[PDB]
Design a protein around this motif. Structure first.
Motif, PDB file in Angstrom:
ATOM      1  N   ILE E 177       0.861  -1.172   0.000  1.00 11.94           N
ATOM      2  CA  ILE E 177       0.000   0.000   0.000  1.00 11.94           C
ATOM      3  C   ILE E 177       0.904   1.230   0.000  1.00 11.94           C
ATOM      4  O   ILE E 177       1.877   1.301   0.762  1.00 11.94           O
ATOM      5  CB  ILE E 177      -1.008  -0.022   1.169  1.00 11.94           C
ATOM      6  CG1 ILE E 177      -0.336  -0.021   2.548  1.00 11.94           C
ATOM      7  CG2 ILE E 177      -1.938  -1.218   1.048  1.00 11.94           C
ATOM      8  CD1 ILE E 177      -1.289   0.191   3.696  1.00 11.94           C
ATOM      9  N   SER E 178       0.645   2.147  -0.927  1.00 10.71           N
ATOM     10  CA  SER E 178       1.518   3.301  -1.105  1.00 10.71           C
ATOM     11  C   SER E 178       0.756   4.401  -1.823  1.00 10.71           C
ATOM     12  O   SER E 178      -0.206   4.145  -2.553  1.00 10.71           O
ATOM     13  CB  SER E 178       2.785   2.943  -1.892  1.00 10.71           C
ATOM     14  OG  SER E 178       2.469   2.470  -3.190  1.00 10.71           O
ATOM     15  N   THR E 179       1.202   5.631  -1.597  1.00  9.51           N
ATOM     16  CA  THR E 179       0.756   6.787  -2.357  1.00  9.51           C
ATOM     17  C   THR E 179       1.856   7.335  -3.251  1.00  9.51           C
ATOM     18  O   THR E 179       1.729   8.454  -3.757  1.00  9.51           O
ATOM     19  CB  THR E 179       0.260   7.881  -1.411  1.00  9.51           C
ATOM     20  OG1 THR E 179       1.347   8.335  -0.596  1.00  9.51           O
ATOM     21  CG2 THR E 179      -0.844   7.341  -0.510  1.00  9.51           C
ATOM     22  N   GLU E 180       2.929   6.570  -3.448  1.00  7.20           N
ATOM     23  CA  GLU E 180       4.108   7.066  -4.143  1.00  7.20           C
ATOM     24  C   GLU E 180       3.828   7.264  -5.624  1.00  7.20           C
ATOM     25  O   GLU E 180       3.134   6.466  -6.254  1.00  7.20           O
ATOM     26  CB  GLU E 180       5.265   6.090  -3.971  1.00  7.20           C
ATOM     27  CG  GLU E 180       5.742   5.941  -2.549  1.00  7.20           C
ATOM     28  CD  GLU E 180       6.818   4.890  -2.428  1.00  7.20           C
ATOM     29  OE1 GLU E 180       7.045   4.166  -3.419  1.00  7.20           O
ATOM     30  OE2 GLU E 180       7.437   4.786  -1.349  1.00  7.20           O
ATOM     31  N   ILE E 181       4.376   8.324  -6.174  1.00  7.04           N
ATOM     32  CA  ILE E 181       4.224   8.624  -7.590  1.00  7.04           C
ATOM     33  C   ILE E 181       5.293   7.840  -8.341  1.00  7.04           C
ATOM     34  O   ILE E 181       6.311   7.435  -7.769  1.00  7.04           O
ATOM     35  CB  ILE E 181       4.304  10.150  -7.831  1.00  7.04           C
ATOM     36  CG1 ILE E 181       3.638  10.544  -9.151  1.00  7.04           C
ATOM     37  CG2 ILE E 181       5.735  10.656  -7.765  1.00  7.04           C
ATOM     38  CD1 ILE E 181       2.133  10.591  -9.066  1.00  7.04           C
ATOM     39  N   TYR E 182       5.047   7.579  -9.622  1.00  2.54           N
ATOM     40  CA  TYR E 182       5.889   6.719 -10.435  1.00  2.54           C
ATOM     41  C   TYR E 182       6.584   7.532 -11.514  1.00  2.54           C
ATOM     42  O   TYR E 182       5.969   8.392 -12.158  1.00  2.54           O
ATOM     43  CB  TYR E 182       5.063   5.624 -11.102  1.00  2.54           C
ATOM     44  CG  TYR E 182       5.889   4.588 -11.818  1.00  2.54           C
ATOM     45  CD1 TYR E 182       6.737   3.744 -11.115  1.00  2.54           C
ATOM     46  CD2 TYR E 182       5.852   4.479 -13.200  1.00  2.54           C
ATOM     47  CE1 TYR E 182       7.499   2.791 -11.767  1.00  2.54           C
ATOM     48  CE2 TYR E 182       6.611   3.531 -13.862  1.00  2.54           C
ATOM     49  CZ  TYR E 182       7.434   2.691 -13.139  1.00  2.54           C
ATOM     50  OH  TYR E 182       8.197   1.747 -13.785  1.00  2.54           O
ATOM     51  N   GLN E 183       7.855   7.204 -11.740  1.00  2.11           N
ATOM     52  CA  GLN E 183       8.724   7.900 -12.685  1.00  2.11           C
ATOM     53  C   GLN E 183       8.911   6.984 -13.888  1.00  2.11           C
ATOM     54  O   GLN E 183       9.891   6.241 -13.963  1.00  2.11           O
ATOM     55  CB  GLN E 183      10.086   8.247 -12.060  1.00  2.11           C
ATOM     56  CG  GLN E 183      10.087   9.416 -11.096  1.00  2.11           C
ATOM     57  CD  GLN E 183       9.471   9.069  -9.756  1.00  2.11           C
ATOM     58  OE1 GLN E 183       8.465   9.649  -9.355  1.00  2.11           O
ATOM     59  NE2 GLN E 183      10.075   8.116  -9.057  1.00  2.11           N
ATOM     60  N   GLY E 194       3.872  15.557 -12.549  1.00  6.03           N
ATOM     61  CA  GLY E 194       4.594  16.261 -13.586  1.00  6.03           C
ATOM     62  C   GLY E 194       4.419  15.538 -14.899  1.00  6.03           C
ATOM     63  O   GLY E 194       3.518  14.709 -15.045  1.00  6.03           O
ATOM     64  N   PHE E 195       5.277  15.869 -15.863  1.00  8.30           N
ATOM     65  CA  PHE E 195       5.269  15.155 -17.132  1.00  8.30           C
ATOM     66  C   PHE E 195       5.761  13.732 -16.917  1.00  8.30           C
ATOM     67  O   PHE E 195       6.753  13.516 -16.218  1.00  8.30           O
ATOM     68  CB  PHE E 195       6.135  15.866 -18.168  1.00  8.30           C
ATOM     69  CG  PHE E 195       6.181  15.164 -19.495  1.00  8.30           C
ATOM     70  CD1 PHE E 195       5.084  15.195 -20.345  1.00  8.30           C
ATOM     71  CD2 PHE E 195       7.320  14.480 -19.897  1.00  8.30           C
ATOM     72  CE1 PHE E 195       5.120  14.550 -21.571  1.00  8.30           C
ATOM     73  CE2 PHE E 195       7.362  13.835 -21.122  1.00  8.30           C
ATOM     74  CZ  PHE E 195       6.259  13.870 -21.960  1.00  8.30           C
ATOM     75  N   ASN E 196       5.032  12.776 -17.507  1.00  2.00           N
ATOM     76  CA  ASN E 196       5.100  11.319 -17.347  1.00  2.00           C
ATOM     77  C   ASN E 196       5.338  10.853 -15.908  1.00  2.00           C
ATOM     78  O   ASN E 196       6.034   9.861 -15.665  1.00  2.00           O
ATOM     79  CB  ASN E 196       6.097  10.708 -18.367  1.00  2.00           C
ATOM     80  CG  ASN E 196       7.576  11.093 -18.160  1.00  2.00           C
ATOM     81  OD1 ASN E 196       8.085  11.255 -17.055  1.00  2.00           O
ATOM     82  ND2 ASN E 196       8.274  11.235 -19.279  1.00  2.00           N
ATOM     83  N   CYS E 197       4.702  11.534 -14.957  1.00  2.00           N
ATOM     84  CA  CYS E 197       4.736  11.189 -13.540  1.00  2.00           C
ATOM     85  C   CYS E 197       3.370  10.600 -13.226  1.00  2.00           C
ATOM     86  O   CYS E 197       2.387  11.335 -13.095  1.00  2.00           O
ATOM     87  CB  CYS E 197       5.013  12.413 -12.680  1.00  2.00           C
ATOM     88  SG  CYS E 197       6.588  13.204 -12.982  1.00  2.00           S
ATOM     89  N   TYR E 198       3.302   9.283 -13.114  1.00  2.00           N
ATOM     90  CA  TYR E 198       2.011   8.612 -13.065  1.00  2.00           C
ATOM     91  C   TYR E 198       1.648   8.188 -11.650  1.00  2.00           C
ATOM     92  O   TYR E 198       2.496   7.716 -10.890  1.00  2.00           O
ATOM     93  CB  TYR E 198       1.978   7.394 -13.990  1.00  2.00           C
ATOM     94  CG  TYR E 198       2.271   7.701 -15.442  1.00  2.00           C
ATOM     95  CD1 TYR E 198       1.236   7.965 -16.333  1.00  2.00           C
ATOM     96  CD2 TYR E 198       3.571   7.694 -15.932  1.00  2.00           C
ATOM     97  CE1 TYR E 198       1.491   8.237 -17.666  1.00  2.00           C
ATOM     98  CE2 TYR E 198       3.832   7.963 -17.265  1.00  2.00           C
ATOM     99  CZ  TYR E 198       2.793   8.234 -18.125  1.00  2.00           C
ATOM    100  OH  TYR E 198       3.060   8.499 -19.448  1.00  2.00           O
ATOM    101  N   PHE E 199       0.387   8.373 -11.301  1.00  2.00           N
ATOM    102  CA  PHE E 199      -0.119   7.760 -10.087  1.00  2.00           C
ATOM    103  C   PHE E 199      -0.427   6.307 -10.420  1.00  2.00           C
ATOM    104  O   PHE E 199      -1.237   6.038 -11.316  1.00  2.00           O
ATOM    105  CB  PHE E 199      -1.349   8.499  -9.572  1.00  2.00           C
ATOM    106  CG  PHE E 199      -1.812   8.034  -8.228  1.00  2.00           C
ATOM    107  CD1 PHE E 199      -1.081   8.338  -7.091  1.00  2.00           C
ATOM    108  CD2 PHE E 199      -2.982   7.306  -8.098  1.00  2.00           C
ATOM    109  CE1 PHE E 199      -1.505   7.916  -5.849  1.00  2.00           C
ATOM    110  CE2 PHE E 199      -3.412   6.884  -6.859  1.00  2.00           C
ATOM    111  CZ  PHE E 199      -2.673   7.187  -5.733  1.00  2.00           C
TER     112      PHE E 199
END
Ligand SMILES: CC(=O)N[C@@H]1[C@@H](O)[C@H](O)[C@@H](CO)O[C@H]1O
Ligand SMILES: CC(=O)N[C@@H]1[C@@H](O)[C@H](O)[C@@H](CO)O[C@H]1O
Lengths: 36, 49, 262, 49, 333, 48
Positions: E177-183, E194-199
């Motif tokens: 379980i996480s709220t971390e954004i993906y690069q 941001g740009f190509n920063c996906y939830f």
């Protein structure tokens, strides 16, 4: 002098072998007729 | 020998025949190969004696 | 609540040799009078274990890693080790396992706790009524989400005792495999002064717990206005298990008599 | 040395120990077990000889 | 099978037998009856709390409930036609009625109707890499069925969400379980977006008029493990009395065998519940109803040899039972 | 290019989803209650 193993007299590890189809037959000449 | 157990009755008490046959085949193959190895070495030792 | 205690002597860590300790029954199947070889995680013979001590001054409950299980040991008088904390970040983003063996209960919690710098237990000292009573439980302040819980039956352990040599010897193995937390243990009475005994004993399995958490750090709790206190004499030992093949000898009674490290 | 111990092995109790399904599966391998009993009986006779 | 001379003629493949001794087929004492010993558990298992539950969580936060200390009944689970797919992997569904287990696990979630094939071990896909992975040595059952009417609404039950992107593939029986954004891009991403920063968590389009293959399916997994511990969860089998010093068929908590039960001298430790041989056969067992230790001895057997003169002389034989005291020949293959 | 003793034709109607259950060895409703094939089956199954 000789420590015999797997003697298999009818009654340990010998019985554990014996219960899985492994048998020991006795020799035809006994230990006394050879001495004779 | 590649099957799920070394106890034959645990294969029998768990699985229905059409795939329990496949495990039992691996057990039979391995155990038969062990017997043939033992018999060959006993023949050679009997020759020496 | 917690109080940042500082009044203690600073010393380098000490090392000790784990002679012939750290062997447990790897499975619950009785075997007898046979030499059986197994491959599992064990503490190697003649390995170097870290020694932590509390005397008089001396009070060290540091953050230690948790990689592939821990052999814990505690040689003790007056039952001063009580607590066990397990987690991976310890700061309210992942659940934490706690074992608290205080004077009343054996509280086992798996809760989303919130800790601080100096979490510990503590009791007052012989306050003219011939008894030490619990007064201090500054481990956490918050618990949001708590899935498992267990409180055992009530009891009362002793809280006094004055000897120059320890007599209680606790041996523990803690493991986490496939979401299972496994506790193995043994108690022994012994006459020793300042180290680990040279001898042999096996460890029965005691408890499985179906936790399913990831643990990489752990930390031990000790029993004791904001400063000025006495520490009871206690020593405890940390060692780490490795995947190493062993040969085990089972006697007539099914009791592990000797082992050979491969 | 003159002789060694006379040992006999039974297949169907060794391989397919007390099973019927295993026996029926073993019958598809032909005559291995009569061969093994023949060889071991030959050794056991030759010891007394 | 008529007489030993006939049996010797049969095993030699001839009609003439010369003088001598012949080893023939073995003999084995047959068991007389069956013995079943199961514990004294009475209560049923809370299956309605799993299947007729109001709410299942999402697949990336799948729920686990531990079933213990009850009497299961898998016939009533198997015979219901409500289940769209029901596949058991380490067992067969028939024999589940007469096995006893140490503890059962129940995993519950919801999935898109086409991703169900990814739940089997060894297959790879979206939820197999990112949400829920099964071990390749799995023993249990997988049950799945659509829940179209009950949860999917025309406004769209968009609370069912699953992880899209993950840093690496996860080990089985784990959960994140996480709220971390993906690069997904080359650049690092801070702040929120941001740009190509996906939830990484994205929700299903669960609305009821959609075609099948996008439907919500409720999936439950049973992950029991077999016979290396004292047992808790049994099937509906009734225990009989206990018979000693007779060749009987024993069924101790699903451990099946044939032999003679004897009052033993082995002093078990209280955490032990079996006892094995060198050849991996059980030779001591603890009765689950009365905590006592019984030795198991296999029944009597042996070779049978026929002594004959030649058939050109007479048709009389004598029979040798090898290594068996004589009294066990009248009792009985 | 084969020859046989005699050929048997079994005819019935089931639901469109139990056609998976007609193969021998697998079990379910229609296999255990209505129509079972032997495990050594030779022949063909046709459904439409
Ligand atoms: C190897 C071993 O521990 N054997 C013990 C024996 O010494 C003792 O006399 C007996 C009864 O207590 O139990 C067993
Ligand atoms: C040599 C030998 O083992 N003889 C025994 C005998 O002592 C015993 O009384 C009998 C019981 O049936 O079985 C046989």
């Amino acid at each position: 002098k000789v420590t015999l193993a797997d003697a298999g007299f009818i009654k340990d590890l010998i019985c554990a072998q014996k219960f899985n189809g492994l048998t020991v037959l006795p020799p035809l000449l006994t230990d006394e007729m050879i001495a004779q | 020998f590649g099957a799920i157990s070394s106890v034959l009755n645990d294969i029998l008490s768990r699985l229905d025949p059409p795939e329990a046959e496949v495990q039992i085949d691996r057990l039979i193959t391995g155990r038969l190969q062990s017997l043939q190895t033992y018999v060959t070495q006993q023949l050679i030792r009997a020759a020496e004696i | 609540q917690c109080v940042n205690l500082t009044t203690r002597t600073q010393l380098p860590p000490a090392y000790t040799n784990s002679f012939t300790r750290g062997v447990y029954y790897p499975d619950k199947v009785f075997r007898s009078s046979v030499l059986h070889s197994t491959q599992d995680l064990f503490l190697p013979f003649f390995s170097n274990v870290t020694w932590f001590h509390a005397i008089h001054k001396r009070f060290d409950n540091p953050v230690l890693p948790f990689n592939d299980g821990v052999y814990f040991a505690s040689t003790e008088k007056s039952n001063i080790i009580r607590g066990w904390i397990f987690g991976t970040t310890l700061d309210s983003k992942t659940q934490s396992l706690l074992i608290v063996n205080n004077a009343t209960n054996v509280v086992i919690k798996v809760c989303e706790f919130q800790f601080c710098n100096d979490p510990f237990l503590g009791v007052y000292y012989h306050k003219n009524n011939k008894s030490w009573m619990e007064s201090e439980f500054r481990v956490y302040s918050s618990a949001n989400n708590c899935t498992f819980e267990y409180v055992s039956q009530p009891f009362l352990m002793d809280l006094e005792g004055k000897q120059g040599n320890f007599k209680n010897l606790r041996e523990f193995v803690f493991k986490n495999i496939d979401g299972y937390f496994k506790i193995y243990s043994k108690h022994t009475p012994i006459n020793l002064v300042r180290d680990l005994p040279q001898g042999f004993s096996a460890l029965e399995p005691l408890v499985d717990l179906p936790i399913g958490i990831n643990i990489t750090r752990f930390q031990t709790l000790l029993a004791l206005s904001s400063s000025g206190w006495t520490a009871g004499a206690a020593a405890y030992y940390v060692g780490y298990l490795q995947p190493r093949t062993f040969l085990l000898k089972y006697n007539e009674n099914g009791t592990i008599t000797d082992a050979v490290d491969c | 040395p003159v002789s060694m111990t006379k040992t006999s092995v039974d297949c169907t109790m060794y391989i397919c120990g007390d099973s019927t399904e295993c026996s029926n599966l073993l019958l598809q391998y032909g005559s291995f077990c009569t061969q093994l009993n023949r060889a071991l009986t030959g050794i056991a006779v030759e010891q007394d000889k | 099978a008529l007489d030993p001379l006939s049996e010797t003629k049969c095993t030699l493949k001839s009609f003439t037998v010369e003088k001598g001794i012949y080893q023939t087929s073995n003999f084995r004492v047959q068991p007389t009856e069956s013995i079943v010993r199961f514990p004294n558990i009475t209560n049923l298992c809370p299956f309605g709390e799993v299947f007729n539950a109001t709410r299942f969580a999402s697949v990336y936060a799948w729920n686990r409930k531990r079933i213990s200390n009850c009497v299961a009944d898998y016939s009533v689970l198997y015979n219901s036609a409500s289940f769209s797919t029901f596949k058991c992997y380490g067992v067969s569904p028939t024999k589940l009625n007469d096995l006893c287990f140490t503890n059962v696990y129940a995993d519950s979630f919801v999935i898109r109707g086409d991703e169900v094939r990814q739940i089997a071990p060894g297959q790879t896909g979206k939820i197999a890499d990112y949400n829920y992975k099964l071990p390749d040595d799995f023993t249990g059952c997988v049950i799945a069925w659509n829940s179209n009417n009950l949860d999917s609404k025309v406004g769209g039950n968009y609370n069912y969400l699953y992880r899209l992107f993950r840093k690496s593939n996860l080990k089985p029986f784990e959960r994140d379980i996480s709220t971390e954004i993906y690069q997904a891009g080359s650049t690092p991403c801070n702040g929120v977006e941001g740009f190509n920063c996906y939830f990484p968590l994205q929700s299903y389009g669960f609305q009821p008029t959609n075609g099948v293959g996008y439907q919500p399916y409720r999936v439950v997994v049973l992950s029991f493990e077999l016979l290396h511990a004292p047992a808790t969860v049994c099937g509906p089998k009734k225990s009989t009395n206990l018979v000693k010093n007779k060749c009987v068929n024993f069924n101790f908590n699903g451990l099946t065998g044939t032999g003679v039960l004897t009052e033993s001298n082995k002093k078990f430790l209280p955490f032990q519940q079996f006892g094995r041989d060198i050849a991996d056969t059980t030779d001591a067992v603890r009765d689950p109803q009365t905590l006592e230790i019984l030795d198991i001895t296999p029944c009597s057997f042996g070779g049978v040899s026929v002594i004959t003169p030649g058939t050109n002389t007479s048709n009389q034989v004598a029979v040798l039972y090898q290594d068996v005291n004589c009294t066990e020949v009248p009792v009985a293959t």
